[PDB]
Design a protein around this ligand. Structure first.
Ligand SMILES: OC[C@H]1O[C@@H](O)[C@H](O)[C@@H](O)[C@H]1O
Ligand code: NA
Lengths: 232, 103, 102, 103, 103, 103
């Protein structure tokens, strides 16, 4: 559906465009997977907030503009200008409270986090916030695709339990639902670095697969100008 | 001149409008001799061709056949919703005359 | 030589500028004999054609008619906002002469 | 007329279908004299060409050969999964006659 | 043969380099008789044309003029940053001879 | 028939492979008379052209020169990684004969 998520961020729109989106810490481009960062939802969710959570290979969002503004005012106070990005839902997004369950570290925050960052095309637009005051005008992103993203939703928690990223010795891996989704080397598996290596590789594979879908949508539109007959 | 695909279809004999309101499920393209064509399917099993060009087509249609194969290839890849197809039903599979995309 | 679409339009008889500032809502394309054309609509119902090539077109326009249909398909599939259309208003639907995107 | 790639491929001798269900691993094109061709591979090593246009082709195939090379480039860049390839198996690499993409 | 757009531009009379390092703000294209051209604008007001094919062009330029309009269109649509344009400064709007894109 | 770009390259005397494994840093295109060409660079400074069509090209290369310019523009815009280039090195910049793309 056309539900939106929201994230306060000091990085301006021009940088977001150059980066291919709103990226996790340490990552300078979405598709350029040369240097492969850690992807771990548990580590990400527990990260400390002068930035809205964006470490360990995910970028966090809020479920309303007001919530993201209030967070922006808490965390980005002392940026005279920041942006609140308006973001479409899509199956790269995980409801943190659902996927980590009772082990979600900040459940009142109701965060939704994007594995591998938020590609530019998934960004609807942005508000400017100047000395804490939301500009009334929403700036719309030309790279956005409404029909595409409005036909998609966040990932179901069942796609995320296996990526929860708990340490091998964490009791979650011995409890429902995660016990049914535990990576190799985790939980009740013999001698539970395998668990963390497999969390990582499962996350990389998820992102590879997801990135193929973005490429397909955006780069096919980029090639819809071709007229064969004119060359034939 | 017609203002929409339904009114365009009404101008032709042996023609039918299929309302799909769905993305294309598969796209197939051939360069084999005498089968230089495209075929699309929808998930409900509906199957359509862009015909091999021949003397059933007037010269002005030749460019448009090529355009339609360009359109179908990229509609498939962008998962664009097809609203309606206008097709000739004196062929199997039905042969595409026009396409509308919306929503 | 005109610097923009409004001045271009004013160089021709029977034309007018439509200001849309909106993406295309529907794209229709036909290969049927004598109706090798494209039609587009906007969500407000405004409808426009790229004409079938004919005797009203000089030779230099033929490549441009094909380019326009290519532009309309990509604009539709990338959800590009169209700013203005220049059209001939003595045709139904109004026939596209030029497009601007901003 | 055929309604799918398997049936289309069956109309020709010295053909077979490869079921890949995978994106293209590499794309190669050449404008070198007498080697104006495209070569694709998949991650399992499978390698396929679009042939240099020559006397084994009829005139109507020429336009389809060019279209096919575009289709392969597009598919490569978009990481689109290719379902099946119909190929001639009396060439090395096997020569593409048709392609299907599904989903 | 030139290594870059600046060296290319210098091979010609009545040319100069514009440096934008910015996306195109507007793209306009026309099929009207005698005005089969494109016009682009940058946010700073800078305006350029791709000239209507004419007597000032040799035959080898015709395909390149068509390619350039294609390039400008897709540069606009993808918001690609344009680095420089080489233009003829004896036309209004200034006429594009070459474009470079880079980030 | 070659199965990859290195083997294809080896069939010509005045060619070499360059191994880039990198996306294109800049794309430049010209419609100026006698310089209807494209130039690409990579971030290490390596610079390549697609040559102006000339007396060195046979008729079959003409369409392939145009295809290669199409390929490089879209490779640039999609940030596709270029694996290898096969080039004629009796020209400056080195003149592209073939390209391979792979991640
Ligand atoms: O086919 C293209 C090639 O033709 C050769 O004769 C020439 O020496 C090369 O530089 C290259 O242009
Ligand atoms: Na959505």
């Amino acid at each position: 559906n056309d539900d939106k998520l929201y994230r306060a961020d000091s990085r301006p729109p021009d940088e977001i465009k150059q980066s291919g989106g709103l990226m996790p810490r340490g990552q300078s481009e979405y598709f350029d997977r040369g240097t492969q960062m850690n992807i771990n939802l548990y580590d990400h969710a527990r990260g400390t907030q002068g930035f809205v959570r964006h470490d360990d290979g995910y970028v966090s969002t809020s479920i309303s503009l007001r919530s993201a503004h209030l967070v922006g005012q808490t965390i980005l106070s002392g940026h005279s200008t920041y942006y609140i990005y308006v973001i479409a839902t899509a199956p790269n997004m995980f409801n943190v409270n659902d996927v980590l369950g009772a082990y979600s570290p900040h459940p009142d925050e109701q965060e939704v986090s994007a594995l591998g960052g938020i590609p530019y095309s998934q960004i609807y637009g942005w508000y400017r916030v100047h000395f804490g005051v939301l500009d009334e005008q929403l700036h719309r992103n030309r790279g956005y695709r409404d029909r595409y993203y409005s036909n998609l939703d966040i990932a179901p928690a069942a796609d995320g339990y296996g990526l929860a990223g708990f340490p091998p010795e964490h009791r979650a891996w011995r409890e429902e639902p995660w016990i049914h989704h535990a990576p190799p080397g985790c939980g009740n598996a013999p001698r539970s670095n395998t668990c963390d290596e497999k969390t990582q590789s499962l996350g990389v594979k998820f992102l590879d697969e997801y990135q193929s879908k973005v490429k397909r949508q955006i780069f096919s539109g980029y090639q819809s100008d071709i007229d064969t007959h004119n060359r034939i | 001149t017609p203002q929409n695909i339904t009114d365009l279809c009404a101008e032709y004999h042996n023609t039918q409008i299929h309302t799909l309101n769905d993305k294309i499920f598969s796209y197939t393209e051939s360069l084999a001799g005498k089968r230089e064509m495209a075929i699309i399917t929808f998930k409900n099993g509906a199957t359509f061709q862009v015909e091999v060009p021949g003397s059933q087509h007037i010269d002005s249609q030749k460019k448009a056949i090529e355009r339609m194969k360009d359109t179908l290839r990229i509609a498939y890849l962008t998962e664009a919703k097809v609203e309606k197809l206008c097709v000739w039903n004196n062929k199997t599979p039905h042969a595409i005359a026009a396409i509308s995309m919306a929503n």
